[PDB]
Design a protein around this ligand. Sequence first.
Ligand SMILES: Nc1ncnc2c1ncn2[C@@H]1O[C@H](COP(=O)(O)OP(=O)(O)OP(O)(O)=S)[C@@H](O)[C@H]1O
Ligand SMILES: [Mg+2]
Lengths: 99, 602, 411, 99, 87
Amino acid sequence: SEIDSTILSQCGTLFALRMNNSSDRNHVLGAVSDSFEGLMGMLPTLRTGEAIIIGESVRLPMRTIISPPPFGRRPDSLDPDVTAKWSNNRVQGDYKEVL
Amino acid sequence: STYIGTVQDVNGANIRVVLDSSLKFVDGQGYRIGQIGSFVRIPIGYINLFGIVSQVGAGAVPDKLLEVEPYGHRWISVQLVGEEGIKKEFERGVSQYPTIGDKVHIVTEPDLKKIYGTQNKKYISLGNIASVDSIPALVNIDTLVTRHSAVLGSTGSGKSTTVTSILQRISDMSQFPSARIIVFDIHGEYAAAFKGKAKVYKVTPSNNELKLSIPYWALTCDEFLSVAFGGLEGSGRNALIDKIYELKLQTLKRQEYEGINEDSLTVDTPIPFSIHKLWFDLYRAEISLKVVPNIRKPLEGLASLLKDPRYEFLFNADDWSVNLDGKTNKDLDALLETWVGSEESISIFDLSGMPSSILDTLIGILIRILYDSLFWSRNQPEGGRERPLLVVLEEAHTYLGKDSRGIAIDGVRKIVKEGRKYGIGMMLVSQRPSEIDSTILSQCGTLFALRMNNSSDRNHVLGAVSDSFEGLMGMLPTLRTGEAIIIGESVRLPMRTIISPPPFGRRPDSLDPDVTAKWSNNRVQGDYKEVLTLWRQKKVRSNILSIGYEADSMTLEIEFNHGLVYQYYDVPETLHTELLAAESHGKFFNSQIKNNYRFSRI
Amino acid sequence: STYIGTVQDVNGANIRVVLDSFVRIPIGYINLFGIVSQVGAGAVPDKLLEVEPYGHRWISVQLVGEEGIKKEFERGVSQYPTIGDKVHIVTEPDLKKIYGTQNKKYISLGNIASVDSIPALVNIDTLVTRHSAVLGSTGSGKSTTVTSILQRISDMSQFPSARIIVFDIHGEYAAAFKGKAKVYSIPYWALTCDEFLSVAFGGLEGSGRNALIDKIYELKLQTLKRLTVDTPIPFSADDWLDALLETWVGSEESISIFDLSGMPSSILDTLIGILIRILYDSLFWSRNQPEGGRERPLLVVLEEAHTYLGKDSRGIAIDGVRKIVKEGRKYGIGMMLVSQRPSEIDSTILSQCGTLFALRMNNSSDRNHVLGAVSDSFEGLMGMLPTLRTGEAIIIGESVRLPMRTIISPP
Amino acid sequence: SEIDSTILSQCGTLFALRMNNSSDRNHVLGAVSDSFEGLMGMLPTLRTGEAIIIGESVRLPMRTIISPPPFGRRPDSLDPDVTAKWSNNRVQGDYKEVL
Amino acid sequence: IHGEYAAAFKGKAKVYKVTPSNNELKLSIPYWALTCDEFLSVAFGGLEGSGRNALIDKIYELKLQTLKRQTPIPFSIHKLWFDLYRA
Ligand SMILES: Nc1ncnc2c1ncn2[C@@H]1O[C@H](COP(=O)(O)OP(=O)(O)OP(O)(O)=S)[C@@H](O)[C@H]1O
Ligand SMILES: [Mg+2]
């Protein structure tokens, strides 16, 4: 719902995944060429991985489960895990180093 | 009676049901068979299709049937939410949608546990669920901290107590011995919740309490000029910047600091420099301890600031006061250690006793001292990567305005945008969501919605929620006191919990002067000459748990709850020993002692 | 028996009822309540009009609060109603309970519009500490209402040691307070230097300002023998200090007034600012004494404020009023805003007034602004403003459990 | 059909005359409690001057022919008579007065 | 609203036209009988901004002036026009 409508309408293909709130669902329906009654009503409960691909890149709209990449080849961000860090017993620190 | 009826319509994401019979208010606890937000389930073959009650009554019957049966309404609309695995787990999304004529049951305790319970170690307990018995509300802790939070509601909703509960449950020494949290208390009420388990910094410390001091040389150039002078923009600004540079270079030549030399010295550098010498030298050219002597008006302004007890937390720091020679007893090491490295996890910078005019520019400064200090040591064992931090902000709608031009907005926006990498959280306690900038409220991860009376703010909340679920958001303006709707990515699904209130005696209360008490007691003549002798110099100098003893000054001393110290003057000591031996506390003192003798609180 | 109809639609916070202003819904052991939000042919479901647009027997009601087992009445509900439930009409005991409170912090200010027996209780502690606000119109006769409030919360029956001040201009309250309250000399040296320059000399700018500050400084010093410039020590007209303080705050009478009709309109803003600053500064330093605001809170009330709290007024009064609004809570200092034309008072100040009394309002701009500057709101509190009876008022704020319609009367 | 029903409801006595369109008969018959098929089905063939009175001003509703007032007392607007004013021979006129 | 009953009662009633004849009455509705909102609607169009407040206040001075010399009380437009247009 935040992407500029004119730009979003010039994308040939779409991979509509699970969509939760009632506003983005409508804004997506409002820029999809092959608005297809059968499949667009099941947007809000596609599982983790499903993707309704709609556009000219496919002859007829699909409902495909994207094949997951093999383990180890997954996207991950090395952000800290507070529960595993706040649990470690405190160690005396010298703040001369921080300053 | 795990049975309701048969699905009659199936729109893929909006099924409907036709209730069959009579509604009974189950006694003992009060849970009815079916509510507006109550969950439902549908066994399909071998798996379970769970849903939420979206609408009840004439609003769910299929449309044209109203023409068929104008006044026949027995239908419900259920929106199907997720699904259960084959004895594996609950996951969202549906592998296969239902057909017409299926069976629709009601949620039972094992399903309560399966949906709501989990096995990950991150999740913790923050109050049990409403409309069902004994189900702790599990909130992911990692996501809640690193993905930022928020609290919203009405004035009497009770958000301070919810925040107190969360902080109490998030810092217990049992599981999190090295926690760390900071609270920018403003009205000054949390300080009563954590009596002997947190550090509190005020402006007028008590006998067993600390003094908040923010040295004036820990500021950048822009911040310091903003606080002191209001942001000069002429050649006077250039003159003052050059003078600050000269003072810092001079002190560095006087004293040595690790790895700083004239080649890498800037105004932003946090090193000591004497304000008094600056003022005196910049004023002599236009004509120390004591302030007796084209930027003149600025220098009268700063001179007035120097000798002002209100500004005793900047220019007359307790031991961060800097001598003439740029020499201080202690460096910023002690300040950082106390603020974030102390032995107590939580610290409270209650800013109630601050000149409101600067309050905003004060908040920002602290947020800049912490972040900038936890960013340049992100590899050491004292940075945010090794012991992350959570910041709390009370009454955020005044500083995070959509159009506000202060500095706090910049700091909070920076923590929201860039705090993920370095483990910095944020918790915005607010009261009028529509005020808060819509770009920042859309980056907060989790939301603790509460009662909201205004229709103009409910719409804002509904329009700015990641999972705009309606079964749990059509009931915003009727929630109880403490009934919270948790929606975000910090929980597997929306929750409708009640927060376990903190035990009696551990609660926040800003000690406001109760007008009833101070106007019911009988009038006693005042010594206004004391008021004048106290104002000229610009200075301030039920239950009973102890009584002071003295028989030489003709005085009495008493202590109440909350650390209130009262000194009663001109009291003959015979009555002192009479009271002490009376063993009548709260009654004899009530009898003829409340309003007989003068007393001055200390 | 009393009865209205049956519930036929629910979406959590909004109910529809089909027939055979407050309303009560029973559940057994507990009692839900509510108010009729929308009525008429527009209340029916959206597409149910097409089927039958002329038979209207649907009423839309909003749940409001819950009542326990004769314990208390608290907002928000723990359960909800479902199809097949009953709806009654509010009776005398129901009003007796929802508006009846056992807390000692509540004081009676009047009665209900329909019923006269039950008082219109208000929490004085919040009314003083949080803040107050009275918005009215020329023909609403706000004077009698505010007088009744002032002399009803300050009676010597239960609050002998009250302390109030009125900054009245038109002098109308002098007649209202014959002898039951005081009525009214500001020294020319107490006020700060800059205010004195502004009031008398006309706001000098050049080096003459510096020379005059200098001269006043040495006159101030030489006064001491027979340290700072701003010291309120007398130096060498009656109008153009312990006794003055006691007369202002230490007087035996509970209330006090300041009639400023005769003074010029030009300097009156600076004078109100000076007075308010003096009071606040004195009661901020006297915090730790029996004379302080912590032991006898003070309340300030001023009328005709819409000419002083404008959106971009440059007077000194706005600064002191803002200081009271923000920091005055801690030191036990209150405030009360009376204004017959609130469209001019800035929103950023009117948004901080906890308790709001509304009187007869006719114009649309005022009716829009009041809704835009309120923390609570009900649908049954917008369309009846212009038809209010003289002497009635609508209370909305956090100092009352629920918003009310009440008539104020002297005791 | 278009008048407000809220203000029409409270009216006590009603006079109804011949009606042609089928959208107004429904509104008028929905404005009366005495739902009689005869009293609102014989409506669209009522001669000029006939009318049915329904309400508490009349003991029993029924159809009656209202007598006409005598010649010389009969409402009529004096709108121009085009056929008579166009039949007469063209008269040369001067528009200077009109301007 | 069609001037159709005037001929019904040749002499049994009295009519109030807007452009009468030598021997007929003239309808007269003094503006000042109107209430504030009605007058603003008829003469101006129901303004809301500062102009509405200015005119509402302006009426008050003239009304109270007339009353003190001797709410539905007479007052003059022309003086209003000149006074607040000369401004
Ligand atoms: N979960 C709760 N259950 C019952 N009472 C609560 C609960 N939480 C808070 N309260 C009480 O409701 C009153 C107000 O709640 P507080 O949280 O203390 O104040 P607050 O108004 O929410 O904070 P501000 O002024 O909006 S920042 C107090 O009497 C609380 O004791
Ligand atoms: Mg609070």
